[PDB]
């Protein structure tokens, strides 16, 4: 009665603050710990590692430890750093199962000497710390003795004292070995997704309640242009596509809960497996190869057009089904592929809907068209330009800006000088929000319009009152259909937001997969069944053409509001 795995591919997720270590003991003198650890770049990309840690005890562990395994340890860390100094904190909690709390002497002080090389670049750091062995807390300050670190200081986390960890009903085996005096040694091996590796070896001496630790490090095989050797690792920040990933995970989690509550697929439960492509082409190909090697046959997601297209090549070649709830560029479904479907519409249709609204209902005097030079935004800007030229509208200029720009002073001064009364922007909320708040600060009265990628609460968060009165194209308000009220209430009961279109397109993708899995487990048979039939969903009855596109899909025109809400424009 094994679970059916479904991959859900998000983008620039935060993820869990706590990470789980699994502890096992093959004999009385050895404890083995296994760990998955992903780092994040300043760019919002993931850098993936796995670790195996070996603890060697001089005297055998007490029988109670050997009878009670495996154990699970939840840990979280904080780092502030310069290029010469590190300030660190760690929290640790042990359990006999996978369910968190849900929301002579033991040690008091310690010192660390950590040294070695990364790609042959030498380092040496020393410093003092303290902690509480009753609750699993520790803190540490480290200073360089050899000047500036010429690699990311994050590569030395988590390596920078399990003598501070208690177990549920008494001392950990680490604490018992320190109190006895005979102690333990540690060896860790880390493997990275680019083929790099790092080893650490530890030795300790106990002077009463004070621990003296020594750690020797050797790292090799890091790419010269990678984030370790360029100092490009950071703590997680919200990024440009986080809003889109959060909507997809909200809709997938509620749909899988509802399906499983009704008995799953002929009694077998669905299990979500989460991945993250950062809407980046190289990360999308790395994710798709991992999904195939993990044995998964069904994928929901790859959200942006520039990441869904390279991923689709890998899934088609390997015989895997892919359903995107969000990618709208026509080229995805224009190449003869048989295993690719959507639960959203096409930018050829979205751009023509915008051009007809401008010609029929707005009738402006002087138009500018702006885009971000990416597949989605530049495609829409070209579709709108063609529609307006056919209607003989006055387009004064057509121009590109750079994605990630925060200073729009040149564009704002040009709109003021050239007396522009209407702008169409093709692109995402981060750039549109900066353009709106900088335009109103400088006294512009211009009417703005954009596509479904700007119609979200992150646009309102960035622009504030400057967002009021923006025109948008987007899918219908599915959250206002009475038949969908039970889903709206279940999402609001978790303090989550059911208003974004990608909640509904993602829920509908899981309902479409469910209908297929009731007929066959084989991806090619599922794609054939959906292309020949109608499926009832939260979006209404869905049908697909032979290339995997929705038949009769319509984008609406709405007024956007500063409170993150959309109303019918007419
Ligand atoms: C996340 C989807 C975005 C907004 C857009 N529709 C694209 O295809 O890139
Ligand atoms: Cl460990």
Swiss-Prot record:
- Can you name a GO cellular component term? outer membrane-bounded periplasmic space
Please identify the protein, giving its name as recorded. Leu/Ile/Val-binding protein
Supply the source organism for this entry.
Escherichia coli (strain K12)
What are the GO BP annotations of this UniProt entry? branched-chain amino acid transport; isoleucine transport; L-leucine transport; valine transport
Query: Where does this polypeptide localize?
Result: Periplasm
Short name of one Pfam family:
Peripla_BP_6
Described by its record, this protein's role is as follows: This protein is a component of the leucine, isoleucine, valine, (threonine) transport system, which is one of the two periplasmic binding protein-dependent transport systems of the high-affinity transport of the branched-chain amino acids.
The record's section on InterPro entries has: Leu-bd (IPR028081), Leu_Ile_Val-bd (IPR000709), Peripla_BP_I (IPR028082)
Work out whether the entry's keyword set contains Iron.
no
Note the SS bond partners. Answer: 279-304
State the similarity comment.
Belongs to the leucine-binding protein family.
């Amino acid at each position: 009665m094994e679970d059916i795995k479904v991959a859900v591919v998000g983008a620039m997720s935060a993820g869990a603050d706590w990470r789980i270590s699994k502890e096992a003991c093959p004999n009385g003198k050895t404890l083995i710990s296994t760990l998955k650890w992903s780092y994040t770049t300043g760019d919002g990309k993931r850098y993936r590692s796995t670790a195996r840690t070996t603890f060697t005890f001089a005297k055998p562990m007490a029988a109670n430890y050997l009878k009670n395994q495996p154990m699970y340890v939840f840990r979280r860390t904080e780092l502030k750093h310069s290029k010469t100094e590190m300030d660190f904190k760690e929290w640790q909690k042990a359990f006999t199962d996978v369910v968190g709390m849900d929301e002579a002497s033991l040690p008091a002080t310690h010192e660390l000497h950590i040294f070695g090389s990364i790609n042959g670049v030498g380092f040496d750091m020393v410093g003092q710390g303290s902690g509480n062995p009753n609750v699993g807390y520790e803190e540490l300050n480290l200073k360089s003795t050899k000047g500036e670190l010429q690699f990311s200081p994050w590569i030395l986390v988590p390596h920078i004292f399990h003598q501070y960890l208690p177990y549920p009903d008494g001392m950990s085996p680490f604490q018992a070995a320190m109190v006895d005096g005979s102690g333990y040694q540690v060896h860790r091996t880390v493997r990275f997704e680019d083929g790099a590796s790092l080893t650490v070896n530890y030795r300790y001496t106990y002077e009463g309640s004070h621990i003296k630790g020594e750690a020797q490090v050797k790292g090799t095989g890091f790419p010269a242009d990678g984030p370790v050797m360029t100092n490009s690792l950071t703590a997680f920040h919200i990024g440009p596509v986080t809003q889109y990933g959060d909507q997809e995970f909200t809709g997938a989690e509620q749909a899988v809960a509802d399906i499983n509550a009704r008995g799953g697929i002929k009694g077998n439960k669905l299990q979500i497996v989460k991945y993250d492509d950062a809407c980046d082409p190289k990360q999308a190909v790395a994710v798709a190869n991992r999904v195939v090697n993990d044995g998964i046959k069904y994928v929901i997601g790859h959200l942006c057009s520039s990441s869904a297209q390279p991923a689709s090549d890998i899934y088609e070649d390997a015989g895997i089904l892919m359903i995107t709830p969000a990618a709208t560029a026509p080229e995805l479904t224009a190449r003869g592929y048989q295993l690719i479907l959507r639960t959203t519409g096409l930018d050829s249709d979205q751009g023509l809907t915008a051009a007809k609204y401008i010609l029929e209902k707005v009738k402006p005097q002087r138009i500018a068209i702006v885009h971000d030079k990416q597949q989605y935004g530049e495609g829409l800007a070209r579709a709108v330009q063609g529609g307006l030229k056919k209607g003989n509208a006055n387009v004064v200029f057509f121009d590109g800006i750079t994605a990630g720009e925060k200073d729009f002073s040149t564009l704002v001064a040009r709109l003021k000088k050239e007396n522009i009364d209407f702008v169409y922007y093709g692109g995402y909320h981060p750039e549109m929000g900066q353009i709106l708040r900088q335009a109103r600060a400088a006294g512009l009265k211009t009417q703005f319009m954009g596509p479904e990628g700007v119609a979200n609460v992150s646009l309102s968060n960035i622009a504030g009152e400057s967002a009021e009165g923006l025109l948008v194209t987007k899918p219908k308000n599915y959250d206002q259909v009475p038949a969908n009220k039970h889903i709206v209430d279940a999402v609001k009961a978790k303090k989550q937001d059911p208003s974004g279109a990608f909640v509904w397109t993602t829920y509908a993708a899981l309902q479409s997969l469910q209908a297929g899995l009731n007929q066959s487990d084989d991806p090619a048979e599922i794609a054939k069944y959906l292309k020949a039939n109608s499926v009832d969903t939260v979006m209404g009855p869905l049908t697909w053409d032979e290339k995997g596109d929705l038949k009769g899909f319509e984008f609406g025109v709405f007024d956007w509001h500063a409170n993150g809400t959309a109303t019918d424009a007419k």
